[PDB]
């Protein structure tokens, strides 16, 4: 059985720069009929995979000329010229010359754009939820770059720990930014034992750490 090896696993590229991805096979994927059945697929966030390239170097209908496939035998390469926001996602190579066919591990294209500070918002538990016996406080960090962001919860000015979870979105296809939500969860009892709930946010696009808060 063949092994398809793709590097790098993750590939930070600046808008408008070129991207080069490697895909190697453990043996020749040249068929005895003389063709080499190697395809490249792109899977964008929240999408199913799409066919970019077939037979080493042939563009699938509707695939821009910025994308090109080359190589022979065991060593193949995808090149993307003038990378754009929309090119983001995980690329895979796929060998179909020999049974069983296999995908490579994938290479994740991450876009490097200019710094963007988050817009920060905080939300108190809804009344409904409180009357169900639990309090979710949410902090939202909208459309920022880079992904690295620090979020600290403070309850009556005491820094919290172990009582919250974060979710970050996939990088955005239109402007190459992230959004993050940290949710702080508490029993109603604990929630009502306190007054000021604040979310303190550190990010490279902010001048000092920004805090958003409310009094319960």
């Amino acid at each position: 059985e063949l092994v398809m090896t793709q590097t790098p696993l993750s590939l930070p590229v600046s808008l408008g720069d070129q991207a080069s991805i490697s895909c190697r096979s453990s043996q020749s994927i040249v068929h005895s009929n003389g063709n080499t059945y190697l395809a490249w697929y792109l899977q964008k966030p929240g999408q199913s995979p799409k066919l970019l390239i077939y037979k080493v170097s042939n563009r699938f209908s509707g695939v821009p000329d910025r994308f090109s496939g080359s190589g022979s035998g065991t060593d193949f390469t995808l090149k993307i010229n003038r990378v754009e926001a929309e090119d983001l996602g995980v690329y895979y190579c796929f060998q179909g010359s020999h049974l069983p066919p296999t995908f490579g591990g994938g290479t994740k294209l991450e876009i490097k754009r200019t710094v963007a500070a988050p817009s920060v918002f905080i939300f108190p538990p809804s009344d409904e939820q409180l009357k169900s016996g639990t309090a979710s406080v949410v902090c939202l960090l909208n459309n920022f770059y880079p992904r690295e962001a620090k979020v600290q919860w403070k309850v009556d000015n005491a820094l919290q720990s172990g009582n919250s979870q974060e979710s970050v979105t996939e990088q955005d296809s239109k402007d190459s930014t992230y959004s993050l939500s940290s949710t702080l969860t508490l029993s109603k009892a604990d929630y009502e034992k306190h007054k000021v709930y604040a979310c303190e946010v550190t990010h490279q696009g902010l001048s000092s750490p920004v805090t958003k808060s409310f009094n319960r």
Binding site: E1, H31, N35, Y37, A39, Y41, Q43, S48, P49, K50, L51, Y54, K55, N58, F60, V90, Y92, F94, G96, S97, L99, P100, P101, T102, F103, G104, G105, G106, S119, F121, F123, P124, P125, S126, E128, Q129, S132, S136, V138, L140, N142, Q165, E166, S167, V168, T169, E170, S179, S181, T183, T185
Partner: protein, 216 residues
């Protein structure tokens, strides 16, 4: 117009069997091969198997003792069956149509949406949905979708009418073994008074449909 859609049961218990149907439109299973591909959470795409136009099949080495693919050309359906389900088998399962070539496809041109299979002994649960009640000329509002199992939920706004400004976060598994996420949307502050915002949450595995008005 070419379509492929997966139909699955969402939740299967360990040791038991998975049956997925791919229903196909706009081409004939008599003239084209279909592949089955899968993707474990956070992990790479895996070729599972294939069923050739004439009805022959081939399988993945790792799964082939538990796999079987068959079809009904007359009904435009293709079936994947798989016994002795493991935790490992939790994945999004895709069917993809073959395109190009003579006896080996040049690629997979059309894919279904994927259907999500979680392998688990736990029972189905529909979400509780709470409002997130509402920057400079801009307002964030959203919905907290909490305590549901298994993935996925679908979230929309204003029955799909409102598309721009939406961020539906990846889910996070809580210590309770239940999932939680939040969908947010940025709106004009000048609209809050005249426009209503209802978030539409759908959890198929439990057959639950919840519409929550998010008021100021």
């Amino acid at each position: 117009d070419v379509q492929l859609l997966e139909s699955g049961p969402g939740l299967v218990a360990p040791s038991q069997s998975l049956s997925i149907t791919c229903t196909v439109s706009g081409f004939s299973l008599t003239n084209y091969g279909v592949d089955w591909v899968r993707q474990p959470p956070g992990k790479g795409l895996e070729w599972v198997g294939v069923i050739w136009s004439g009805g022959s099949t081939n399988y993945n080495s790792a799964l082939m003792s538990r796999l079987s693919i068959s079809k009904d050309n007359s009904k435009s359906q293709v079936f994947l069956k798989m016994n002795s389900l493991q935790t490992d088998d939790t994945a999004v399962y895709y069917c993809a149509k073959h395109w190009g070539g003579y006896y080996i496809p040049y690629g997979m041109d059309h894919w279904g949406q994927g259907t999500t299979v979680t392998v688990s002994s736990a029972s189905t649960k529909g979400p509780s949905v709470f409002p997130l009640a509402p920057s400079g000329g801009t307002a964030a509002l959203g919905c907290l979708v909490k305590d549901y199992f298994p993935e996925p939920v679908t979230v929309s706004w204003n029955s799909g009418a409102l598309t721009s400004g939406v961020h539906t976060f990846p889910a996070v598994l809580q210590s309770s073994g239940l999932y939680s996420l939040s969908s947010v949307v940025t709106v004009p502050s000048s609209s809050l008074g005249t426009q209503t915002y209802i978030c539409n949450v759908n959890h198929k595995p439990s057959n639950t449909k919840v519409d929550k008005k998010v008021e100021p």
